[PDB]
Write an enzyme that holds these catalytic residues in place. Structure first.
Site, PDB file in Angstrom:
ATOM      1  N   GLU A 193      -9.773  -4.649  -3.017  1.00  8.64           N
ATOM      2  CA  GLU A 193      -9.006  -3.597  -2.346  1.00  8.64           C
ATOM      3  C   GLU A 193      -9.824  -2.499  -1.675  1.00  8.64           C
ATOM      4  OE1 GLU A 193      -5.764  -4.014  -2.035  1.00  8.64           O
ATOM      5  OE2 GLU A 193      -4.753  -4.309  -3.950  1.00  8.64           O
ATOM      6  N   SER A 234       0.827  -1.202   0.000  1.00  8.12           N
ATOM      7  CA  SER A 234       0.000   0.000   0.000  1.00  8.12           C
ATOM      8  C   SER A 234       0.867   1.260   0.000  1.00  8.12           C
ATOM      9  CB  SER A 234      -0.973  -0.030   1.185  1.00  8.12           C
ATOM     10  OG  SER A 234      -2.021   0.901   1.002  1.00  8.12           O
ATOM     11  N   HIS A 293      -7.605  -5.611   1.356  1.00  8.72           N
ATOM     12  CA  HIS A 293      -6.399  -4.813   1.178  1.00  8.72           C
ATOM     13  C   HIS A 293      -5.444  -5.063   2.340  1.00  8.72           C
ATOM     14  CE1 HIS A 293      -4.153  -1.092   0.068  1.00  8.72           C
ATOM     15  NE2 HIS A 293      -4.181  -0.779   1.351  1.00  8.72           N
TER      16      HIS A 293
HETATM   17  C1  LIG Z   1     -11.065   9.943  10.222  1.00 10.60           C
HETATM   18  O1  LIG Z   1     -10.606   8.614  10.166  1.00 10.60           O
HETATM   19  C2  LIG Z   1     -10.389   7.945   9.059  1.00 10.60           C
HETATM   20  C3  LIG Z   1      -9.919   6.653   9.420  1.00 10.60           C
HETATM   21  C4  LIG Z   1      -9.485   5.747   8.369  1.00 10.60           C
HETATM   22  C5  LIG Z   1      -9.541   6.200   7.029  1.00 10.60           C
HETATM   23  C6  LIG Z   1     -10.027   7.461   6.703  1.00 10.60           C
HETATM   24  C7  LIG Z   1     -10.447   8.365   7.727  1.00 10.60           C
HETATM   25  O2  LIG Z   1     -10.861   9.618   7.373  1.00 10.60           O
HETATM   26  C8  LIG Z   1     -10.967  10.079   5.935  1.00 10.60           C
HETATM   27  C9  LIG Z   1      -9.114   5.211   6.084  1.00 10.60           C
HETATM   28  O3  LIG Z   1      -9.171   5.322   4.826  1.00 10.60           O
HETATM   29  C10 LIG Z   1      -8.631   4.014   6.937  1.00 10.60           C
HETATM   30  C11 LIG Z   1      -9.405   2.729   6.805  1.00 10.60           C
HETATM   31  C12 LIG Z   1      -8.722   1.441   7.006  1.00 10.60           C
HETATM   32  C13 LIG Z   1      -7.775   1.122   5.856  1.00 10.60           C
HETATM   33  C14 LIG Z   1      -7.020  -0.159   6.077  1.00 10.60           C
HETATM   34  N1  LIG Z   1      -6.290  -0.173   7.390  1.00 10.60           N
HETATM   35  C15 LIG Z   1      -5.446  -1.346   7.840  1.00 10.60           C
HETATM   36  C16 LIG Z   1      -4.173  -1.567   7.042  1.00 10.60           C
HETATM   37  C17 LIG Z   1      -2.962  -0.980   7.528  1.00 10.60           C
HETATM   38  C18 LIG Z   1      -1.763  -1.033   6.740  1.00 10.60           C
HETATM   39  C19 LIG Z   1      -1.774  -1.685   5.504  1.00 10.60           C
HETATM   40  C20 LIG Z   1      -2.973  -2.307   5.028  1.00 10.60           C
HETATM   41  C21 LIG Z   1      -4.170  -2.289   5.811  1.00 10.60           C
HETATM   42  C22 LIG Z   1      -7.196   0.000   8.582  1.00 10.60           C
HETATM   43  C23 LIG Z   1      -8.023   1.306   8.403  1.00 10.60           C
HETATM   44  C24 LIG Z   1      -8.875   4.367   8.420  1.00 10.60           C
END
Ligand SMILES: COc1cc2c(cc1OC)C(=O)[C@H](CC1CCN(Cc3ccccc3)CC1)C2
Ligand SMILES: *[C@@H]1O[C@H](CO)[C@@H](O[C@@H]2O[C@H](CO)[C@@H](O)[C@H](O)[C@H]2NC(C)=O)[C@H](O)[C@H]1NC(C)=O
Ligand SMILES: *[C@@H]1O[C@H](CO)[C@@H](O)[C@H](O)[C@H]1NC(C)=O
Ligand SMILES: *[C@@H]1O[C@H](CO)[C@@H](O)[C@H](O)[C@H]1NC(C)=O
Ligand SMILES: *[C@@H]1O[C@H](CO)[C@@H](O)[C@H](O)[C@H]1NC(C)=O
Length: 534
Positions: free
Chosen positions: A326, A199, A439
């Site tokens: 994804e 990622s 993902h």
């Molecule tokens: C405000 O909070 C927010 C919190 C999050 C987003 C946007 C936000 O605001 C726009 C996202 O888009 C994230 C959603 C998930 C994406 C995948 N990951 C885990 C992961 C970690 C490292 C590599 C692969 C997977 C956990 C959270 C969290």
């Protein structure tokens, strides 16, 4: 010299620890500093090389994780907490971990892991990043670096030397420079260093391929579910500035000058910047992060696209690919109608809302264009089709298509490309079935977690993990994931003409062509032209 756990480096002596791995044992040098603590006046500044130390550095325990936002959406849930910092957070976090097979090799392949997390989070100390299984099984020296995330590593005010931006990327470069300079003492081959990440980490890898100041520090590269040209991976200098000033406004800072904005942001405690971090996003959206790499004109000479077109990047071999679903992770966290415990069947109204969030920089014609592309008008009120269609939209727009663009552009000047499509759902996956092949869930197979019986994986999942680990290691060592003169199925080379790739699952290898061209012609060629005309 004395023991196997004692290494004398150019920075000083380091003491490791013997770690148990599948009945056998290997060495581990955890928490080695590659830079001076970016604390105090150095916050937001470029990384400074770690002043050499006298005596022996205790490298038996994991280092501190960088200051970042902590996921608290599903407390106790392993699926979301496995990505959270498992060590104490601190601004003094610029360290690296090395797993050396035993006995210590003389000159073997090196692999440097770069964690993901949207540039606002991530830790090299996570369980799924334990390089002991890969180092032991494949006989490689596994290194995992760390870099400043969030505002700490990516606050950008172009023109200022106190916070120019991209310092999180420079942290990675200094770790790579430390590997180039010292990995030999740990039995690693500086001539054969493969950088790989997932990622945000995969985008970083691609960014090092593009940046001339990073090209010479590594041999090959592996990009997992990430590309340097991802719509969320970078912002302009104007946008970076706008977000930096907005961060200051949220903390009651003096905004009359850069010198005063930065001074203010430096006096504020770590958690103060994190609490308001998301408030700076320009649009209401998903798969968008606040402080990310900027197109400064230094780390990146010109626009990523112009660089990709002119062949202004490191010519070598690359191995990259994407997961089947994804976008699910992001729809679960910000799109209306999605929840961890329901089948999440999406209504026509919620679908239209999902599109808006997925393509924030789009107008009405663009929104209609996206909808038209992913809608079955013969059955438009289907909850499962709307859910799955929205998952494809987020994944294609944010990961798959931008990666496919990078693949086609790179291969033209490159020296060898290998593309994969990981589409296997882990039997022990704690997330709901509707999310599919999520993902980041190929990482466990890359790091060989399925070999550990206590983790409830199936037999074929162990066979798959071993197959993947060997592809990665063999590619890092030679530049070809295929074993020379082997009797197994051959993974085709991706060429500009044929455009072949393979599926990475538990079934016998199957070869395909033109990975999601239908959708990617829309995202990479049509939509950008439509939005541009209007
Ligand atoms: C405000 O909070 C927010 C919190 C999050 C987003 C946007 C936000 O605001 C726009 C996202 O888009 C994230 C959603 C998930 C994406 C995948 N990951 C885990 C992961 C970690 C490292 C590599 C692969 C997977 C956990 C959270 C969290
Ligand atoms: C990767 O680069 C190597 C080295 O430039 C290429 O190997 C050369 O290929 C040409 C054309 O086939 C031969 O005439 C040379 O004899 C080769 N040199 C060596 C040292 O083997 C190789 O073809 C490139 N691979 C790809 C996929 O582009
Ligand atoms: C740090 O080093 C000491 C020996 O100096 C040893 O107990 C171990 O390697 C480390 N101890 C702790 C508590 O981290
Ligand atoms: C494996 O299965 C057992 C029994 O259901 C369970 O308690 C344990 O948490 C599982 N382990 C993992 C890593 O999921
Ligand atoms: C993008 O849009 C701008 C403004 O309309 C236009 O000047 C430019 O030519 C467009 N780019 C392309 C490749 O059409």
């Amino acid at each position: 010299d004395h023991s196997e756990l004692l290494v004398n480096t150019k920075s000083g002596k380091v003491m490791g620890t013997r770690v148990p791995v599948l009945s056998s044992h290997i060495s581990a040098f955890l928490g080695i500093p590659f830079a001076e603590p970016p604390v105090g006046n150095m916050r937001f500044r470029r990384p400074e090389p770690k002043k050499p130390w006298s005596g022996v550095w205790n490298a038996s325990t994991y280092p501190n994780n960088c200051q970042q936002y902590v996921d608290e959406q599903f407390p106790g849930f392993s699926g979301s907490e496995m990505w959270n910092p498992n060590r104490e957070m601190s601004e003094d976090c610029l360290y690296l971990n090395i797993w050396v097979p035993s006995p210590r090799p003389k000159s073997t392949t090196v692999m440097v892991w770069i964690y993901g997390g949207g540039f606002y989070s991530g830790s090299s100390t996570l369980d799924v990043y334990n390089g002991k299984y890969l180092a032991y099984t494949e006989e490689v020296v596994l290194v995992s670096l760390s870099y400043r995330v969030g505002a700490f590593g990516f606050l950008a005010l172009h023109g200022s030397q106190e916070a120019p931006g991209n310092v999180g990327l420079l942290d990675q470069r200094m770790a790579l420079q430390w590997v180039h300079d010292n990995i030999q003492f740990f039995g690693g081959d500086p001539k054969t260093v493969t950088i790989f990440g997932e990622s945000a980490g995969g985008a970083s890898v691609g960014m090092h391929i593009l940046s001339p100041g990073s090209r010479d520090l590594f041999r090959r590269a592996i990009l997992q579910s990430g590309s340097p040209n991802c719509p969320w991976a970078s912002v302009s200098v104007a946008e970076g500035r706008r977000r930096a000033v907005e961060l200051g406004r949220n903390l009651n800072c003096n905004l009359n000058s850069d010198e005063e904005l930065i001074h203010c942001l430096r006096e504020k405690k770590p958690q103060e910047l994190i609490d308001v971090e998301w408030n700076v996003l320009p649009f209401d959206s998903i798969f968008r992060f606040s402080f990310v790499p900027v197109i400064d004109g230094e780390f990146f000479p010109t626009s990523l696209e112009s660089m990709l077109n002119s062949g202004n990047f490191k010519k070598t071999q690359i191995l990259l690919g994407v997961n089947k679903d994804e976008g699910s992770f992001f729809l679960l966290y910000g799109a209306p109608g999605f929840s961890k415990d329901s089948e999440s069947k999406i209504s026509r109204e919620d679908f239209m809302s999902g599109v808006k969030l997925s393509v924030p920089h789009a107008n009405d014609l663009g929104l209609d264009a996206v909808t038209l592309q992913y809608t079955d008008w013969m059955d438009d009120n289907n909850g499962i089709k709307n859910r799955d269609g929205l998952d494809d939209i987020v994944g294609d727009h944010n990961v798959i298509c931008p990666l496919m663009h990078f693949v086609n552009k790179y291969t033209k000047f490159g020296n060898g490309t290998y593309l994969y499509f990981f589409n296997h759902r882990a039997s022990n996956l704690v997330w709901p079935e509707w999310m599919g092949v999520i993902h980041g869930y190929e990482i466990e197979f890359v790091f060989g977690l399925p070999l550990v019986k206590e983790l409830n994986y199936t037999a074929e999942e162990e066979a798959l993990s071993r197959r993947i680990m060997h592809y990665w290691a063999t590619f890092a060592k030679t530049g070809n994931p295929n074993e020379p003169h082997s009797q197994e199925s051959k993974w085709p080379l991706f060429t500009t003409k044929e455009q072949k790739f393979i599926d990475l699952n538990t079934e016998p290898m199957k070869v395909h062509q033109r990975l999601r061209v239908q959708m990617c012609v829309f995202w990479n060629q049509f939509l950008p032209k439509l939005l541009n005309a209007t």
